[PDB]
Amino acid sequence: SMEGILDFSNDLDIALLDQVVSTFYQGSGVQQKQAQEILTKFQDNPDAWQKADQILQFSTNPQSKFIALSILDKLITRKWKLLPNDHRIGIRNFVVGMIISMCQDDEVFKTQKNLINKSDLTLVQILKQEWPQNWPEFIPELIGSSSSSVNVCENNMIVLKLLSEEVFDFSAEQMTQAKALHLKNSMSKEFEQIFKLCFQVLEQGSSSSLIVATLESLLRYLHWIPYRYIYETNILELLSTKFMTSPDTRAITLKCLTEVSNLKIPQDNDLIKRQTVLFFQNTLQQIATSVMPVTADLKATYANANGNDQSFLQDLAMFLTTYLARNRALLESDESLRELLLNAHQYLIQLSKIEERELFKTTLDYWHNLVADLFYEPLKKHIYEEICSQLRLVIIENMVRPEEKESDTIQLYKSEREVLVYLTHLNVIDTEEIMISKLARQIDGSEWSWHNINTLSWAIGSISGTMSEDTEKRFVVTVIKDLLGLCEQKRGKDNKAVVASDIMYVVGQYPRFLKAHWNFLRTVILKLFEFMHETHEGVQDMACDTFIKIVQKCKYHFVIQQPRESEPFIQTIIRDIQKTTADLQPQQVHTFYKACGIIISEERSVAERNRLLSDLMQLPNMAWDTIVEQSTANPTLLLDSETVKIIANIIKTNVAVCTSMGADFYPQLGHIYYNMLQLYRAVSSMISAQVAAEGLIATKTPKVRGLRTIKKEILKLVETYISKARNLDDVVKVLVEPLLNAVLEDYMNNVPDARDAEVLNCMTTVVEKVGHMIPQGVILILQSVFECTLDMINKDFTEYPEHRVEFYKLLKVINEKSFAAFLELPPAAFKLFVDAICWAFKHNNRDVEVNGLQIALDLVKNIERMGNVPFANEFHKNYFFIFVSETFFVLTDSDHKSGFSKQALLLMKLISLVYDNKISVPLYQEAEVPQGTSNQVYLSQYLANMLSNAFPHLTSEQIASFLSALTKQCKDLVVFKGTLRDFLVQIKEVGGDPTDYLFA
Template sequence: MTRWKVLPREQCQGIRNFVVQYILQCSNSEEALKTHRTLLNKLNLVLISVLKQEWPHNWPTFINEIISACHSSLTICENNMIILRLLSEEVFDYSAEQMTSTKTRSLKTTMCAEFAQIFKLCQEILNSATQPTLIKATLETLLRFCNWIPLGYIFETSLIETLRTRFLEAPEFRNITLQCLTEIGGLQTGGPDRLNTYDEQLVKMFTEVLTSISNIIPLDMDLRTTYPQSNSRDQEFIQNLALFLCNFYGMHLPLIENLPNRDFLTHGHFYLIRISQIDDREIFKITLDYWLKLVQELYEEMQSLPISDMSTMSLGLMGGGAPNPALLTNFPLRKHKYNEVLSNLRIVMIEKMVRPEEVLVVENDEGEIVREFVKETDTVQLYKTIRECLVYLTHLDVVDTEQIMTEKLARQVDGSEWSWHNCNVLCWAIGSISLAMNEETEKRFLVTVIKDLLGLTEMKRGKDNKAVVASNIMYIVGQYPRFLKAHWKFLKTVVNKLFEFMHESHEGVQDMACDTFIKIAKQCRRHFVALQPSESEPFIEEIIRNLGKITCDLTPQQVHTFYEACGYMVAAQGNRNQQERLLSELMAIPNAAWDEIIKQATVNPGILQDADTIKIIGNIMKTNVSACSSIGPYFFPQIGRLYNDMLQMYAATSQLISEAVAREGEIATKMPRVRGLRTIKKEILKLVETFVDKAEDLQAVRTQMVPQLLDSVLVDYNRNVPGARDAEVLKTMSAMISKLGGLMEDQVPVIMENVFECTLDMINKDFSEFPEHRVEFFNLLRAINLHCFPALLKLDNRQFKFVIDSCLWASKHDNRDVETAGLNMCLELITNIAEKTDVQTSNAFFNQFFITILQDVFFVLADQDHKAGFKTQSQLLMRLFNFVHPSDGTQPKIQGPIYQPDQAQPGTSNREFLGNFVSTLLQNAFGNLTPVQITAFVEALFALNNQYDKFRLTLRDFLISLREFAGDNAELYLVEKEERERDAKAAEHERRSKVGGLLKPSELEEEEL
């Protein structure tokens, strides 16, 4: 895998022959095959690795040899089928990230060219062999070929007939033949507009297989009860049947829709309904993807009709007059062929609904109702897909959807279907279709739902039952902000109900009440500060007035959420005087507690040693942070009120920490009291950072906040022992510099003086200590380089070299965040030097650092542990080559020499020096490379340094060809992956924004609701 090219040719030949002979020896009889199965599996993989190096250029006869060997023995033939399967997988399924693009293309071309004789061999075996293991191995190999071989091999031979016969007549091959037929059923043939001979064969295959399936599984069989008792082969068959139907319908549905016999359409879909009902998440996911595709297509067809045509057609259907004859060519729509299927599907989707992210009260494995802590990403994704499917189903027939949900809710109320699970899934489904109905329908539907659920809360006895219903009410109301905004009294009733739930002691209910409150506060914020009809004051006034009573049973964390929620309302008050009054009243309780502590501390500083006082101060700061995060720039009066006392508190707590460390050593920083004091410091910094991030009057921040902050924070950081230095100081400095930009230029020297060397000294001993400081240190350097670059140039030579060394050191770090920050800073720094400094400064910089940076970039590029940084590494290398000799012919950015006098003759061009230097570097590092390979690679780096995509591809192919990168190379393909994901995300958002309800209310701006 890694050193093959270094071996002399005769040794390569010897190893190759040895492996082949050993494989033949281990597979020349049934007994040998059984005895050596494990070893043989390994030998087969070794042969594939050799083939990737040798075939076709050094071993052009391989395919002929393997086919000839098949005729010598049935067991050798069986193992050779496995080798051909592995080769197909390697070339067509896994090659992208294992081989260079040229090599991959070459192997695919060769495989396709040689395929005729492989296919002929497979057919011979399937038509004449009787040995089950050989037939199975051949079918498994054929299965791997199905997705890439030319269509002619499938449709112009007897292959489909052979497979169908095996399916019908040999139960032991039923699963593998059905998998092959599934692959064939998913192939693109003549397309929906014309029926060609390939399509005819596909339809024939499908109808005959479906007919035979009805003899195996009766259509009315309830798979929910029979599936769990089935043996593993029968269970596998059900899964394969799901794949077969989904694959075929997914690709060729119009062919079946147009058949005169409708049974092949409806029966197949009812099988899928039965399969979807099975309690098996993996099987359900298979069918779910198909259902989503179907309902989306049916919806899009409905949308493609002009609105006038749709309304006329609806009138005709409802007895309001005959539809326009011109429309009958389009009628019935495809969706009408599926009425019964879709109605059943709505029930399936409701009953299969999984827990949304917003629901925090769940039933655990022991059947208890508890607070949910861990998010299951699989469940979150499944919820999104089911939700999308239900939204489309609602659009396709809103009356049927409403009726099914209302009837199911009635059965919860009358107790006939009551259970925690049934109540949950129904309510999650109801919450998932917000905005999919028109406003009038939504209003009628929701009034019924909430009324029934509130009645259910009163009716049910027992805390668990009440907690389940309460959680469902909160989830549903949180999903329907449009309804709440349009019905003020209902909104007020709901919020008051949430306030009631905030006193409910059952695990998770209070959390959910607070989470729902903040969601409603965010989406309906203006309604809380406006004077509503028949009200004597805005509702926010009542909330703030009763804030103490409402939150008295909440934990501190829940109180912080409550303050953040109220903050959204305060920020929505447009009148500045009113807003400042509301802010003052909102913060009255924490401010009173703060004032009392400050007053007591002035008289007796010792109270700051008290554990309860420390906890209270921490919570006051956290409350301010929460409120500031939602109130934003309007928080200025409040932070102004606290600012000076807050910085004095910072200094006082810092003094106490230092004294504790001096008394007890660095172990003191781990003690509960000192940790509590550090929390106060961190929260003070977090409050400043949060406010600065939201601030709009930057000049006021610079003059009124920055000087005092730096005075309080920097010297304290510098003189503390390493264990007592807070990474948050570095984070806050980065935030200040990023937000205020050039306004902070004159402050950079004092920041660097106090944090640079002392932090560097903490982190340069190894790669593991002080992980948070590492990340924030490099983020700070990056922020200075990006936003205050001139200040960086004013550092003395020693400090400047420290900066460069630090950033190169970071690029080799095993912490991804540190590595990323280091690489990005290096890239941004050389760009700034080349483009924003005078020629003299630029020449001096590159003369001193160009080669050092280049060597370090090549070091991390060739290091397997640093594949994750490939995107930035390649950008950095391209920039270095471009600065020396741009491939577009423009003037080089670097005018002076990049080498020292002892490295090259005076007058040597940078282009010549760089080419020779890199060639020597690579030759010394990789002895297996030929001079021709190295020269071609280096020339490509010069030729492509203006085209990032081609430069990156060349670099990636080179790394893979080194064989140093055998294994998982996914991270070398990160750019393509990111681009695909970004494009897909944008297209997905565009698609979802066009269908009412596909974007959740929380994903929409308030104005869009």
């Protein structure tokens, strides 16, 4: 029954509308959901605007009048210029009158603020269409009507606020360059009279709601108005004194003063400098006397969260950091301004103690600005020594966990480290003293806690590389000592664990110290090995992460024979590796082997490096040899989940070591390569035999997933070596051909759900590194993966997401390195190739879309380089206009905004081909256009017709003007893009001005 409002042949029952509306907003469940769908169908009726005048005069529901104005908004912004001029004036008149009538009724004005705001916004939409050209008296009449009534005056401030927003803050996306400039110039021309009204209301007015609205409009004005209106009118005194005392006006006033702290200012006028000093002085005085003194506990205040305290302290932080980043130099020389400078910074110190991550980052960004300036600028740091001393404590005490899952925490640690490093350079002694002192209160239990000892250890670790080696030495020793005694002092389990982790973290951050103290370094490592047998949760993971961390930094000291030692320490690690790693999980074993690989790669003697390599790999190589014997014997073993897991861990170990050693890993790869690819084939047969015997569900089972893990790790190992290989002759002549024989046919002839996308990734690396040397191999790759993978991904944008991504990375690199492989494609296959590229255009998926556009661009450049030959001439004849129109489609369809820049580049390249006469043959049929017509004339003609049918609501003049500008600007990307953006605005409405495309 609620569906009756959807019948326009009858008069609209306003009472029925109000029931649908009430059911939607105040109702629930099915009733609400039904009214929602009805109201949506109502609002979207293209005649619904005609019934807006009824609703606005005769409804009693504010939500109904709001929805009526939404309907009007759609009409005004999209179809305004289609109306007969009678309806435009009529709509304008009964919007103006509805606002005046609401402002005159004090009760409605007070209680229907939502509906008045919506009406003002609607009025603003009309102004964007009609003002000033068809409404030159709007601003003069607004200024006159303001004095007749406080309610109307207050509402006119709302109207001006929204107008300034629509013209200056939100126009870049919503209107053409020409229309935006027109409205900006129009507001700028009449602002003298706007400012006069605003200044009088502020100087004289006493209505709080009127003052607040006027200041809220001023905030918008400060985004664009010239500086003279601010520095030559005494308004700074009003803002920084009168309006900071009242809490009603204090929030907006502070936001205004923050913006003022960014006005365009000449840096040489002495008075402007004094005015800038003065409004800061006034503002800080009002805060100290009306809000809270410099000594106030802002952390406690913020935690209590009374009234608007939190927003005020946020706004204060923004004001102080903004002003001081630009202007603190004005306060640093005059001795009478020193108290102001330091009180402002003392407020910031107190604000920096608040528990609020995002506010802390705001203050921390300022501190970085400051301490970096004190580090470089002569004679400045002594001014801030007491500020900086307090900041050392704030940062040390709020240090967050370093990476050593949470990237916001990781970014915050790095920012904290940066400021604390500066602070340490500024006073190394104060920093050491604070840190030693904090540590004493860990030992004496007054500040002991898991968090507090972690925080301090992170701080201590963060300043590595700032002190002198001798002070570092004395410093580091003292810390470790104090940390060791702190560990003994604890009798607990987790207690003893925490202090141990922190100890190993600190030492891991001071490689310079470890490098110069071998005896200590050795003892550190051996204690890590001890910890690799500790079953307590998290210790083993800690030991391994520290081990490789130290190794990356100190590897050279493991590869040389150290005095007092009979062998390089890497040999000692390798000898006992089985014992050392006996209690570790597989992931942690591979990290250990990887760490050993880093060391071994430092040995530059080839024969010693290879010996170390084969020693390191002795255990996995023996397990490997055993399995290749007892698994080739009875292939049934590979169904034993335990053997499958063992196999995967052997290969994972080779991956880990190959990751560290890269080119140097080749000897170990050669030991397993041929049998590894045979294992790849055997595992492949089992997966296939399992899918045949159980169905596609087999691919979800642990057995088959374990078998595919083997295949994936084999591919990853090959990928890892080839991407780092330095001897490419061996890659091409030893590795590639066995590899392709092993993986390509197996991929082609498996059912879709059994194909590994890692095959494509592996082939991408092969083509990347040696693609230029294996043209026949690249052709074979395409033959084996191109069509069968395309058929997997060309039915929707969702299935087989990994194949989708890797597929277009493979085509991208083939198109880069071995374009000849696409020349060899049969015409039907090269056509699938074009289809595949355009298919990529239409993905919202950024990983696919970006490569699709790059392949298109690279393909055009590949074709262009061929010159005037039959393949290029056929390409342009067959596909030039497909690429033009497909690019235009994603540019204009509103679902591919993220690719705008590369779409524009592609479109500019295509148009420039024609207007540089780089296409040698006619793009048209011998029939459809007179003999001798230039491709330029035919392109302009094809596109005009294309756009006329795709966007039929555009005038022939709009299209013709747009294309003229576009073709003129095909050598100027940024202007080209502006013209495309202008087009995107115009296609959203009726009656766009074709002269807009002359903006540039």
